[PDB]
Design a protein around this ligand. Sequence first.
Ligand SMILES: COc1cc2ncnc(Nc3cccc(O)c3)c2cc1OC
Length: 457
Amino acid sequence: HSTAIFSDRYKGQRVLGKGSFGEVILCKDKITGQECAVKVISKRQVKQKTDKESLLREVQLLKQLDHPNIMKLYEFFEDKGYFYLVGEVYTGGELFDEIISRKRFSEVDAARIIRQVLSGITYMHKNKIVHRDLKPENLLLESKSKDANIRIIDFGLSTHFEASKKMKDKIGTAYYIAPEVLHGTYDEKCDVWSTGVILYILLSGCPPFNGANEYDILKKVEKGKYTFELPQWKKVSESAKDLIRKMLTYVPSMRISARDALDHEWIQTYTKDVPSLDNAILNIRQFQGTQKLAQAALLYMGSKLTSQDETKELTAIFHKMDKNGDGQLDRAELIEGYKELMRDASMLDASAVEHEVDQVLDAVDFDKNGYIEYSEFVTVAMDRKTLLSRERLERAFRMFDSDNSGKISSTELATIFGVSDVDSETWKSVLSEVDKNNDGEVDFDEFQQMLLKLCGN
Ligand SMILES: COc1cc2ncnc(Nc3cccc(O)c3)c2cc1OC
């Protein structure tokens, strides 16, 4: 009786993105053609909180649950290096990204969104599963269809896997975390808090607990005080604010349950004219742009560091293989070395690696059937990746620069690096090196230069 192997059943199609605990890859069943989203968790980056037996039983429960606002889990695999969580793929994108693409957004739209989130949470709580890490990135629209349901992803994972301590993994997280989670004694009510934070953001476009860096955010959360004194709260019903107050009640025993929040006047009224919350949409668009650029900045720097690491490793690997030291290896060798290297969730299969080597060889018009100058292969394969990383950062810079100025101001940098939790005198120091003219703004290239200096380059 033999243990099921992930790659015997599924082939990788493409990377969907980064989520909590790992990369998510669009895969396909090699027999049935079923497409799925597979979260690949590396045992080297992510430690388990529970034992094997506890995880296996949770997975077995999760597979049997079914609700229109919860991600479906189909299968689970484990091998020496990874866990694989095989789920249904959702293609409508993140909630907040759909919201900012509309010209209109009212309390009716927010109530219908929150009803869905509370409905999913209610179901999971009845089944004794807690999310703990509910945030906007965990709310995916099922498809691009006008009336697509919201699907909450990652329920139950935080019970089994330890959260990363790396800022590139923590972007966004502090705004939403319940104060009792910080102090250690928590239960399912933490999910109602996080929902309350999200609803506050839907209706005003600003986090209720904010600050200039991650720890300042956490300090505000822990104090637990917030207000509705912003001008844009004047546009909002008293019932919406009453529900928020109940969800952001500090002592969790006193906080409203998810199921009771579904019976709240605000949900009952607004989910059956109502003005558009235009200032809120404006603020959400800004919030989202900033969060996305900070994230892109951190991933860019991570990509540069991974390249410094991998380029020299790949070179030493091939140097060792080149037994007579003439610098030439054949394609089967390049594949074996690239394999020794990956020993990138999308490259955890021999066939995917073969395919990638062929893409690199074709890029440079190296003939695949003879012997190849390996140092040139390494350069090409790494320059491709450096080019890709540069292009992802740029897209995010252009998105943030919504007036098409070509520039990010000093004040905007302060906001971005604060979200990125890059030390203020540190980024200011690097800005003084780059901005020799006291223009107090940077273009894309200059911004990229700052990021390189903030990762030792
Ligand atoms: C299109 O973008 C994404 C689409 C996704 N669709 C479904 N699940 C995801 N994540 C997931 C999949 C399996 C288990 C799990 O806990 C979480 C997704 C992630 C995406 O990007 C990160």
